[PDB]
Coordinates of C-alpha atoms in Angstrom, one line a residue:
Chain N
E102 CA 34.0 34.1 12.5
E103 CA 33.7 31.0 10.3
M104 CA 30.6 29.7 12.2
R105 CA 29.1 33.2 12.1
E106 CA 29.5 33.3 8.3
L107 CA 28.1 29.8 7.8
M108 CA 25.1 30.4 10.1
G109 CA 24.6 33.9 8.7
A115 CA 17.9 34.1 15.3
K116 CA 21.0 32.4 16.6
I117 CA 23.4 34.7 18.4
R118 CA 27.2 34.1 18.4
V119 CA 29.6 35.2 21.2
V120 CA 33.2 34.6 22.0
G121 CA 33.5 34.5 25.8
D122 CA 36.2 32.0 26.6
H123 CA 34.8 29.2 24.4
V124 CA 32.7 30.1 21.4
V125 CA 29.0 30.2 22.6
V126 CA 25.8 30.0 20.6
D127 CA 22.5 31.0 22.1
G128 CA 19.0 31.4 20.9
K129 CA 15.5 31.3 22.3
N130 CA 13.2 29.6 19.7
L131 CA 15.2 28.0 16.9
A132 CA 13.9 25.6 14.3
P133 CA 15.1 22.0 14.5
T134 CA 17.0 22.4 11.2
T135 CA 19.0 25.3 12.7
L136 CA 19.8 23.2 15.8
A137 CA 20.9 20.3 13.5
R138 CA 23.1 22.7 11.5
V139 CA 24.6 24.0 14.7
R140 CA 25.4 20.6 16.2
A141 CA 26.9 19.6 12.8
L142 CA 29.2 22.7 12.8
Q143 CA 30.1 21.6 16.4
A144 CA 32.6 19.2 14.9
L145 CA 34.6 22.1 13.5
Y146 CA 35.8 23.2 17.0
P147 CA 35.7 20.9 20.1
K148 CA 35.2 23.8 22.6
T149 CA 31.8 25.1 21.6
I150 CA 28.9 25.8 24.1
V151 CA 25.4 25.4 22.8
Chain H
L152 CA 25.3 21.1 5.7
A153 CA 22.8 20.2 2.9
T154 CA 19.4 18.8 3.9
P155 CA 17.1 16.5 1.9
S156 CA 13.7 17.3 0.5
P157 CA 10.6 16.4 2.6
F158 CA 9.6 13.9 -0.1
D159 CA 10.1 13.3 -3.8
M160 CA 7.6 14.2 -6.5
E161 CA 6.7 11.0 -8.3
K162 CA 5.1 10.6 -11.7
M163 CA 1.4 10.0 -11.7
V164 CA -0.1 7.1 -13.7
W165 CA -3.6 6.8 -15.1
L166 CA -5.0 3.3 -15.6
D167 CA -7.9 2.6 -17.9
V168 CA -9.5 -0.9 -17.7
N169 CA -12.1 -2.5 -19.9
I170 CA -14.0 -5.8 -19.1
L171 CA -16.4 -7.0 -21.8
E172 CA -18.5 -10.1 -21.7
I173 CA -21.2 -11.7 -23.8
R174 CA -23.2 -14.9 -22.9
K175 CA -25.7 -16.8 -25.1
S176 CA -27.6 -19.9 -24.6
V177 CA -30.3 -22.1 -26.3
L178 CA -32.4 -24.8 -24.7
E179 CA -34.9 -27.2 -26.4
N180 CA -36.9 -30.1 -25.1
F181 CA -39.3 -31.8 -27.6
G182 CA -40.9 -35.1 -28.5
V183 CA -43.0 -37.8 -26.8
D184 CA -41.7 -39.7 -23.8
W185 CA -43.2 -43.1 -23.3
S186 CA -43.1 -45.7 -20.5
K187 CA -40.2 -48.0 -20.8
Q188 CA -41.0 -50.6 -18.1
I189 CA -44.4 -52.3 -17.9
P190 CA -45.9 -55.3 -16.1
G191 CA -45.5 -58.7 -17.8
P192 CA -47.6 -61.8 -17.9
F193 CA -48.5 -63.9 -14.8
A194 CA -49.3 -67.5 -14.1
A195 CA -50.3 -69.3 -10.9
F196 CA -51.2 -72.9 -10.0
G197 CA -52.6 -74.4 -6.8
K198 CA -53.9 -77.8 -5.8
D199 CA -54.7 -80.0 -2.8
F200 CA -53.9 -83.6 -3.4
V201 CA -55.0 -84.8 0.1

């Protein structure tokens, strides 16, 4: 939920580990995502 | 999560340069120029005793 709010083309799902998926994302969005990666160790990009 | 700007807007500076120069000259060459080295007197002697 926190990452969904902060990010809010990227799609967020729960699965077993929180998963982020997107087809054509700008490099800034990818950088923001990998920065938010430090919030939770079990994230799948 | 903050990102930097692509670049920074700098102040623009206008330079105005002036280079001024004046030259003046005078040349004169006047009078009479004479010879200062001339031939001098000569003397010669010759004899046959025998």
